[PDB]
Design a protein around this ligand. Structure first.
Ligand SMILES: CN1CC2(CCN(Cc3ccc(C(=O)NO)cc3)CC2)c2ccccc21
Ligand SMILES: [K+]
Ligand SMILES: [K+]
Ligand SMILES: [Zn+2]
Length: 357
């Protein structure tokens, strides 16, 4: 029963040279790492080295053209970096961005391998830039390569093609890239909870709605839990897990659980507008630990309040280490629109999951 931790200060080198105050700050990962030390969680984890993802590994999910374009930014002049950035939705690029994206991907590969070989039971990856918005052919929403999707394929590549991977995406944004990459795949189950507001919340696509259940063989293996009607918090996320995430996950019976763990639904996030507490995230973590014989990898995605993300991810690691979950306040009355959301997801997926009937 060992917990791995991967963190490399080199991933701070990715920066926005046109707005040094952009919220995807290098200090996101250094502040999370610092808090793990202060709380004395770091000395209880087995440290896992970062490594560069290879170009071949990037090809598990991404087109050669997308790879070589991002690769080329490494030697671009500032004017070319600025032009290239404007060809994507919400992307800034510096000369170090490509290397940082490879470091984030490879760090998760080493973690998945450590888990799947039994060197550790579970693991946390404190990495940036994030991944879940990145598509097969394009970068998007602060993300260059889809770190979680690549780690799922990497895990299958060192075990077997049909390794059942669950990706739980609790970042406040829909992970459009992860959904699309696995949309017709029945070996990777994708479950996303996200602020939706009938398509008005980033990334502003109806792909995020509850009726997108997957395609062909992948029907039923894409689960969108969209929130409408303003602020959500622990009661709604607890109920989504109890009524949807955990019943479906148990029926799927993953052999590995990847968490796309953005912490931008946390209280205090300047962008998410939600109220999930660190104790809330501890409890979501604890529940997922009941799956896949405990084989859980937590991968940092978004999250923009330096204190909120540092307290929230620390609590998750605390859970992975075996600590007992902190008490929760008043989970009872959900917002009406959240009950409606959960009922829409239940109606969408009951055809595919007997546990929902
Ligand atoms: C009407 N909006 C405003 C907005 C401005 C910039 N933010 C960028 C962004 C991306 C990812 C994450 C994250 O944390 N993902 O997990 C957080 C912020 C998004 C929304 C935008 C961009 C493009 C088109 C339309 C619009
Ligand atoms: K999400
Ligand atoms: K899928
Ligand atoms: Zn996000």
């Amino acid at each position: 029963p060992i917990t791995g931790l991967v963190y490399d200060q080199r991933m701070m080198l990715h920066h926005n040279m046109w707005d040094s105050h952009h919220p995807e700050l290098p200090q996101r990962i250094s502040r999370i790492f610092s808090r793990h030390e202060e709380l004395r969680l770091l000395s209880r984890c087995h440290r896992i080295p970062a490594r560069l993802a290879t170009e071949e590994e990037l090809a598990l999910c991404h087109s050669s053209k997308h790879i070589s374009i991002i690769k080329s930014s490494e030697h671009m002049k500032p004017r070319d970096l600025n032009r290239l950035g404007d060809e994507y939705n919400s992307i800034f690029i510096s000369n170090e961005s490509y290397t940082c994206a490879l470091l984030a991907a490879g760090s998760c590969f080493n973690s998945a391998q450590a888990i799947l070989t039994g060197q550790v039971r579970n693991a946390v990856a404190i990495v940036r830039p994030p991944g879940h918005h990145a598509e097969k052919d394009t970068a998007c929403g602060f993300c260059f390569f889809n770190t979680a999707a690549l780690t799922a394929r990497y895990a299958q590549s060192i075990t077997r093609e049909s390794l059942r991977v669950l990706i739980v995406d609790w970042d406040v944004h829909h992970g459009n890239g992860t959904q699309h990459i696995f949309e017709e795949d029945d070996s990777v189950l994708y479950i996303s909870l996200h602020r939706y507001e009938d398509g008005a919340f980033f990334p502003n696509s109806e792909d995020a709605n509850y009726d997108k259940v997957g395609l062909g063989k992948g029907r039923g293996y894409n689960v969108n839990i969209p929130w409408n009607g303003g602020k959500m918090g622990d009661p709604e996320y607890m109920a989504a897990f109890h009524h949807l995430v955990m019943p479906i996950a148990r029926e799927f019976a993953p052999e590995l659980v990847l968490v796309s763990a953005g912490f931008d639904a946390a209280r205090g996030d300047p962008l998410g507008g939600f109220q999930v507490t660190p104790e809330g995230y501890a409890h979501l973590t604890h529940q997922l630990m009941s799956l896949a014989a405990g084989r859980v990898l937590i991968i940092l995605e978004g999250g923009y309040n330096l204190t909120s993300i540092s307290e929230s991810m620390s609590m998750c690691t605390s859970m992975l280490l075996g600590d007992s979950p902190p008490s929760l306040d008043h989970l009872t009355p959900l917002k009406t629109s959240a009950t409606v959301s959960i009922n829409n997801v239940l109606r969408a997926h009951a055809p595919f999951w007997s546990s929902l009937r």
